[PDB]
Amino acid sequence: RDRRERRLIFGTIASKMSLAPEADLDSLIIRNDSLSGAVIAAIMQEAGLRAVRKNRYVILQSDLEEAYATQVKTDNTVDKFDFYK
Amino acid sequence: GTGYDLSNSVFSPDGRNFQVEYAVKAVENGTTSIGIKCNDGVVFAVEKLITSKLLVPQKNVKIQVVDRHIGCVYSGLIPDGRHLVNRGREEAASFKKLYKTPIPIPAFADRLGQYVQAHTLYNSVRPFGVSTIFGGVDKNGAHLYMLEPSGSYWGYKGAATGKGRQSAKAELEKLVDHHPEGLSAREAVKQAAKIIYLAHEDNKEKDFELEISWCSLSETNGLHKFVKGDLLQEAIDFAQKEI
Amino acid sequence: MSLPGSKLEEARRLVNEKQYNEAEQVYLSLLDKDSSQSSAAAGASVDDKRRNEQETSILELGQLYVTMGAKDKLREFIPHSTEYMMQFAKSKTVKVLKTLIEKFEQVPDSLDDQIFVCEKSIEFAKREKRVFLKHSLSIKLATLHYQKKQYKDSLALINDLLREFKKLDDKPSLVDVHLLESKVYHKLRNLAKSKASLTAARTAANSIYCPTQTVAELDLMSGILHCEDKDYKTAFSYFFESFESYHNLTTHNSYEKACQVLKYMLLSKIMLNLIDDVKNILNAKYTKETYQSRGIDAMKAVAEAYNNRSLLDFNTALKQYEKELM
Amino acid sequence: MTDRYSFSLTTFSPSGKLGQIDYALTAVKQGVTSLGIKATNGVVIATEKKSSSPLAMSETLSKVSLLTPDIGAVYSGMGPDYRVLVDKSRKVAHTSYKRIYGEYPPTKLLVSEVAKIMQEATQSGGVRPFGVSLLIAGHDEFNGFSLYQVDPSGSYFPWKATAIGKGSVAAKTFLEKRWNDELELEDAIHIALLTLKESVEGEFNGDTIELAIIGDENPDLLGYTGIPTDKGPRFRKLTSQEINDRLEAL
Amino acid sequence: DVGGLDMQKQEIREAVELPLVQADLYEQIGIDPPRGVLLYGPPGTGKTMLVKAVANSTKAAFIRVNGSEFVHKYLGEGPRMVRDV
Amino acid sequence: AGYDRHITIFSPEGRLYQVEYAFKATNQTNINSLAVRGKDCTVVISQKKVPDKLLDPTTVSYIFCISRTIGMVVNGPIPDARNAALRAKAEAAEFRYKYGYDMPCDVLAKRMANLSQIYTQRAYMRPLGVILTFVSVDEELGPSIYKTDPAGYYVGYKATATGPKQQEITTNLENHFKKSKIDHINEESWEKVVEFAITHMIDALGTEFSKNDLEVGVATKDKFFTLSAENIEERLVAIAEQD
Amino acid sequence: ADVKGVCTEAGMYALRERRIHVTQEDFELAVGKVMNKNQET
Amino acid sequence: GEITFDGIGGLTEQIRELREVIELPLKNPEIFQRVGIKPPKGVLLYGPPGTGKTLLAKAVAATIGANFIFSPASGIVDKYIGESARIIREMFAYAKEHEPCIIFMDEVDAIGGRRFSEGTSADREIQRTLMELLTQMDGFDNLGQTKIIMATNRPDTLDPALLRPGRLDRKVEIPLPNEAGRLEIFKIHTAKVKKTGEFDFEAAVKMSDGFNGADIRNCATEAGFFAIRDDRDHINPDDLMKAVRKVAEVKKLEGTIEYQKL
Amino acid sequence: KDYSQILKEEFPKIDSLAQNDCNSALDQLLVLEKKTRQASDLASSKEVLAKIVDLLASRNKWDDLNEQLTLLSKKHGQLKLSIQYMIQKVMEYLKSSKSLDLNTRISVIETIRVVTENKIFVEVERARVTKDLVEIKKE
């Protein structure tokens, strides 16, 4: 999908989730490259699990960025390729 | 598809090379040889398995000398081991022509390192399935190197190869911990023959012959020669006494 | 010093201390000074990299000409800046041309001054081979004729864009053509051409990617066309999804755009004769926040007029709020 | 030692084609998506810079190289196969022209020499064909502006506008209605930006997009004055700040 | 609670919820409504979100049976349980 | 038919198998190395792993010195590394002889990349199983890092990384540049950039290194040298005291 | 199949307006939906 | 009780991964309700063999004490008529009865893969076996007290649909321990081994190349036989390095999985 | 062990202004961190870190102490739960001082980011910090 389809997902799941006013969801939307709907659900869950290890409560901007690169690639490295340029 | 192991330059899907791995297996099928590094030089030792009584004693030279101070010993196929020494002799001779003073030990390792690697890049030729152990007394201190079939090498305080490589290398770690500060060149001569007899348990089914050649600045003063006279028989009785 | 930051910060202070007219002469002193790379602009000094700071200086003062009364003088100020940019590289030509028009049309001004400036900017595209620049200004020009309430000049440009954008270029810009064309026939009480132009706008909406402001204006004008056949239950979904688009824009758009959406949502619920749903929106703080006026509270008495079923209470606030609600 | 493979790695398939070239076009269609367009006042070519690592430096990478001062080039294929081909393309350009005719070869005569190197790799043994497709565009004093499309097979064709890459199917179809007989140098730039923007899945800026245009001869970029014969090269590459100027112009 | 599927949600509600309410709309327009709706795309993401929303919105008879649940340890029991649904 | 995965040719999937298999041979040693660019210079740090006690740590080095102004760091097998090391020194010295002055870092990574493609495009030879990473400070762009590859494509990086944990090292170092919005470290002294890279290396790799567990190269302006075991140990003590 | 798709989708848009007739508004929306399916993938 | 948290040492960095998905939701489930995140159900364990992935199952059973069910991949494959699909429903049938239950999975290389149907000699029993494991964690049946621990030797042999979120939320990787993690393992296996008072395990740290937690145990086992020939009750520390060097030549096969492993 | 000498650490720092309270207590800070870090729930003595509260209270302004609480919140503080105990220590002297320090107490609440940043709620005392600010606004 594109940024237009995913922007209705992040904002919808974060409604029941507890976030911070300093964190911006549109910052990750630009960083999202052709993702699916299930992977987004794992990002919001992993961001909440990292708050327990850091002794936090609300989801900050750093919790979303650190939990991004972990769950964004589900196969090997990047789209099961390396680099083509 | 099959055929990863047919050619040389073909890389395996796991990241290895079959022609390199099969060349290492041929190293353990030959006669064992070890080495000991000292402060003023290095000591080489080799165990030649005697086939029958028809062998004339001490007429087979296992340790071939390049230039003067550079000794070489190999465990593996005979022609592959002699070709590296014959090629290394031309490298040491061509060096002294332009560069005057002889080539040191760490610089001589780069000559064989690039030469053996050139065989693995092309399918026209094959790599060397022999492990060559070379060293001596260079301009600064001393160095010892063991050339692997893959072309990889580093500095070795001790070297073990051949059929008894498993039990011989374990004894080299005891010699390092015994004298961590330093080891004399005369004591390493008797210790070299002792490790060979400790590794002879695997080769005990056949006859053995002891050949030891050392080089240092204490006695020979930059000369790599064999051991003759009562010095060779003295190391035999000292090593066999502990058995 | 000669740094560009010292010239801009010193001029911004003079606006609050005394007046912006004294700081305007400081920006005029930047035309013959503050040299830069590439070629010159007006011939007095070389301005290329420093033109962006000079453009922002006009943008800051551009909203301040309302008090001075220079709106009539602003007619010839914009086109003269185009000739000054022909000396150096043309990469900055579209910046000063497009950005000023967005700010010049944002502030309240007479419709005569807005049209005459856009007509002069197209003259630069007429002498040249410019295509996208002339077509981009034609949409903004025809939009100005729409506020003029003249269908002769409005339909003249739209009919010329249909024979072009359809067969040549500007797939996303074609949506704004059908959207503007549907507005022209909407004021003419013609439901045949207005609903046909809206259908063509929705056809290219899902085919070509459109930004938030473009999609928000499609559903906003859509629900208005659903007021003729009534059925306000389905028409409320258009204004409901539209309000979420204008509310997310916040300061990126005008507050009057999102404030009017609340007037149509409350009116659609009154037609459905639902008292509780109207009070639930008014009592909700997130639906109002910084948006409040007398026209918003005028419909609150209308909902209470039907709840209590009293005509005298409706006619009392009818003429009092006529200047706002009506 | 030497080389023991003298046989051609490219053989004729039973269907009447070559297996190496048939699979060479697949590697071109999957990768960086470039494009190009020719106008009356110049030629506008553009390409997108992909990011393999977030710490990679885009300034150290040149997607549009320089064959001759009047002729540029852009590639949608693999990086290495482009550099060796261009490094050999500048040698045959200086040896056969600068060292013989003394001037630079035109666009029509240069594409024949560049395609001559690729067509030899498809036959002579020990080597493999190039999996890259180069767009050669330039200007001369007679034929004018011309743009050629060099295919990995070794054949070249002239094109008014073309696009090669992942979006080569959609972009080439769009350029049919976006091109006409009268265009300027700056007018064709906006056409290249509207087409490439739809093919950008990553960050959209001037650092990830390489835009090079061929304009009039520039005396400032030449480096010397006083000679009316040479007014400077027509090839120019817009910097990071200069590309961002026309991105907001859309 | 699930965004971004409004494109595929409208098609299902018209082919599922719409004919169950007013069945005379299809007879007037002369269009045969499909007897059901399938779903495709990459597994492990959707297909459970839109069906769950219909069951809660319709509040009527709903039958959820796994695909491999029809297989029973007895031979003839398999086909008998299929017609019973 | 099935020979598409043996010698390099266009595959039915439009890829190159031998090129993809070459990346798996670069991690054979499993050594993580990272380099950050200081203000006036660039520092590189690589893991020093000595498997056996018989190996001399001073002789074992994964970082080669091409010239006084150019350092080189290689992650992969040493025989393919020394083959490319002796070759890179021949082409680097050829530039000073032919062109009269010292080669910058971007050109040396460009010539070795085109040479590595000869190892690829030609079907009778194989590509190198190593990745050449050159660290040098030029006279124009100043500090720069260019990373090569067996495919022959060189590209510059801000903070380079390698090894199996490279994904964890690159992600950990990415948050520093994106937050500070800087392309290089603002530390002027070359001693500060050494301790800065060690802090992010320990937290990312989850390992406390010792004096013999690291090899830290330092490339200054018109000078290059490798820190010994005493200099590396001195930096580790100051980190634990300050932080 | 694309011609039948326009005819099949012609009645789909009529269900949104809850009308028993199909005017030009549905055909314009039906063609735009089918033309996007052919150009996709 | 046999293996405890002390014997699994060296994995401490990866031990807290299981405590968050097991110990945390069972001890205080209200924490996930405050933030609003859903408790993770399935947890994936993958990596090279011999790293202690199985020991993670035995360490929890001897500490938490909750009722656990070991579910091997080859124990449920018994087939008569649709038998493997019924046995799976039998294991999850105890989830609604006993709430504190966590069902494990032992080294699944077979029924965890995708393997769609083309030919394959009537695989419908294994094909429907995959459909049952993807049922209980998908359909409207709600549990929340049952965790799914699935161990495997590689993620590439698992169904990409199973790897999608909603079934396995957190994938806990167990790679080879680092040089600082190996040293703790040598003291675990040699704790009950009688030897001399002077011992140094830092020698075997450098000697260990690509070894796992299991292969370190073989080094202490092989070293015991070296003292039997010499009639020694205590193991010579010099003989410890002899076994480590011996184990280094035992593998010869692969030992490195990187690019295709997550 | 090393916790028996904690009383004899600083002789002069009680009488004088003690500008070394940051540097001298640092030697007792980083050493006890390596033995605990985030592993043990309770290991090191939490009263050692609370000595900073007893160093400068009445003899120094409350702005210098709030700057040290920021560094302790970002760092470990010899224990991950050390912040749990420090909250009760900050609220101990506020009710026992008063005098002219009531005007500075308002700025202390807004300066400390521990009570502002959300946590796992280890103590109820930090929740009443904002409650005391409400009583100030009432007066």
Side-chain angles (χ1 to χ4, degrees), chain C residues 49 90-92 94-95 98 128-132 136 167-171 208, chain D residues 40 174 177-178 182-184 186-187 190-191 194 241-242 245-246 248-250:
Chain C
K49 183 178 179 180
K90 294 177 179 177
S91 63
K92 271 69 179 181
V94 179
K95 293 178 178 178
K98 183 178 179 180
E128 294 178 350
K129 294 177 179 177
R130 297 293 181 189
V131 175
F132 295 160
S136 296
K167 294 177 179 177
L168 296 175
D169 287 341
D170 290 344
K171 294 177 179 178
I208 304 301
Chain D
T40 59
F174 295 160
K177 294 177 179 177
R178 294 182 182 175
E182 294 177 351
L183 293 174
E184 292 178 350
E186 296 301 321
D187 290 344
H190 300 290
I191 296 170
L194 294 174
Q241 294 178 336
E242 293 177 350
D245 291 344
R246 294 177 179 83
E248 294 177 350
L250 297 175

Side-chain angles (χ1 to χ4, degrees), chain C residues 16-159:
Chain C
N16 291 336
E17 292 177 350
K18 294 176 179 177
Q19 63 180 19
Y20 63 91
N21 190 30
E22 296 301 321
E24 183 178 2
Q25 294 177 336
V26 176
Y27 297 141
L28 296 175
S29 63
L30 296 175
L31 296 175
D32 59 353
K33 294 177 179 178
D34 187 4
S35 64
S36 65
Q37 295 299 321
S38 178
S39 296
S45 178
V46 176
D47 290 343
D48 186 6
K49 183 178 179 180
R50 300 290 182 268
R51 179 60 179 165
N52 291 337
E53 292 82 357
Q54 294 177 336
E55 181 179 2
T56 301
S57 297
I58 296 170
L59 295 175
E60 294 177 351
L61 296 175
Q63 295 177 336
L64 296 174
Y65 294 99
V66 176
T67 300
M68 183 65 73
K71 295 176 180 177
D72 290 344
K73 294 176 179 177
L74 295 175
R75 181 183 295 176
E76 294 178 351
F77 293 161
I78 294 171
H80 295 165
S81 296
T82 300
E83 294 178 351
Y84 296 141
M85 295 183 287
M86 293 177 70
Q87 295 300 321
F88 60 90
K90 294 177 179 177
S91 63
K92 271 69 179 181
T93 299
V94 179
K95 293 178 178 178
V96 176
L97 188 146
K98 183 178 179 180
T99 300
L100 292 175
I101 294 171
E102 294 178 351
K103 302 299 183 181
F104 179 80
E105 294 177 351
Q106 185 64 59
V107 296
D109 187 4
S110 178
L111 296 175
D112 291 344
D113 290 344
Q114 294 177 336
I115 295 171
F116 295 160
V117 174
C118 295
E119 293 177 350
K120 294 176 179 177
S121 296
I122 297 171
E123 294 177 350
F124 296 97
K126 293 177 179 177
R127 294 182 182 175
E128 294 178 350
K129 294 177 179 177
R130 297 293 181 189
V131 175
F132 295 160
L133 178 62
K134 183 178 179 180
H135 296 166
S136 296
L137 296 175
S138 296
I139 295 171
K140 294 181 181 297
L141 177 63
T143 300
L144 296 175
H145 298 291
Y146 175 76
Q147 294 177 336
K148 185 179 179 180
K149 294 177 179 177
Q150 183 65 260
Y151 63 90
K152 294 177 179 177
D153 291 344
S154 296
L155 295 175
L157 296 175
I158 294 171
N159 290 336

Side-chain angles (χ1 to χ4, degrees), chain A residues 19-38:
Chain A
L19 275 67
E22 294 178 351
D24 186 5
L25 296 175
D26 291 344
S27 296
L28 296 175
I29 295 171
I30 296 171
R31 294 182 182 175
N32 296 132
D33 186 4
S34 295
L35 295 176
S36 64

Side-chain angles (χ1 to χ4, degrees), chain F residues 172-202:
Chain F
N172 190 30
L173 295 175
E174 182 179 2
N175 291 336
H176 181 62
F177 295 97
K178 301 299 183 181
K179 183 178 179 180
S180 296
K181 294 177 179 177
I182 59 173
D183 291 344
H184 61 78
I185 304 301
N186 291 336
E187 295 301 321
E188 183 178 2
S189 178
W190 58 273
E191 294 178 351
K192 302 299 183 181
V193 296
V194 175
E195 295 177 351
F196 177 81
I198 295 171
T199 299
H200 299 290
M201 181 172 175
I202 294 171

Side-chain angles (χ1 to χ4, degrees), chain B residues 151-199:
Chain B
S152 63
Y153 62 89
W154 291 276
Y156 293 94
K157 294 177 179 177
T161 187
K163 294 177 179 178
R165 180 176 64 85
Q166 294 177 336
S167 63
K169 184 178 179 180
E171 296 301 321
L172 295 175
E173 294 177 350
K174 294 177 179 178
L175 178 63
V176 176
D177 291 344
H178 183 197
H179 300 290
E181 294 177 351
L183 177 62
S184 64
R186 294 182 182 175
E187 183 178 2
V189 176
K190 294 177 179 177
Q191 294 300 321
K194 183 178 179 180
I195 296 170
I196 293 171
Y197 296 142
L198 295 175

Side-chain angles (χ1 to χ4, degrees), chain B residues 88-109:
Chain B
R89 181 177 64 84
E90 294 178 351
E91 295 301 321
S94 296
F95 180 84
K96 291 189 295 184
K97 182 178 179 180
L98 176 63
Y99 294 92
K100 190 173 178 289
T101 59
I103 183 168
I105 304 302
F108 177 79

